[PDB]
Design a protein around this ligand. Structure first.
Ligand SMILES: Cc1cc2nc3c(=O)[nH]c(=O)nc-3n(C[C@H](O)[C@H](O)[C@H](O)COP(=O)(O)O)c2cc1C
Lengths: 52, 52
């Protein structure tokens, strides 16, 4: 509840960061950020399970 | 970076979720969220490096 506003910003933000992952010219940076955003989605699902 | 304003809000948000971990009632959820927020902090500092 107290975090519904913050998740309201957070979820499009994760979408934008995973979308910006494709735009990195560097291949290592693109691979790391793409894997990190995949991990971040599962993490944030678990985090809001814990908060809820 | 079109994420500069985002991170200015993202890191205080991570702090608030770390503080809210302490007020969870199941102790295992408290431990799990605390550890999660620590990692979230380190990981988003990295992601902010990859976006620059
Ligand atoms: C990634 C992210 C970006 C945010 N960006 C903004 C923003 O640009 N403007 C804003 O007012 N709140 C933003 N927020 C929400 C703030 O963290 C916070 O909920 C808001 O300032 C309301 O504060 P209050 O609870 O004291 O009213 C963002 C949250 C996150 C997680």
């Amino acid at each position: 509840s107290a975090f519904d506003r913050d998740f309201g910003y957070l979820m499009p933000f994760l979408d934008r960061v995973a979308a910006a992952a494709s735009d990195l010219e560097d291949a290592s940076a693109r691979a790391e950020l793409t894997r990190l955003m995949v991990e971040e989605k599962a993490r944030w699902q678990r985090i809001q399970e814990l908060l809820g």
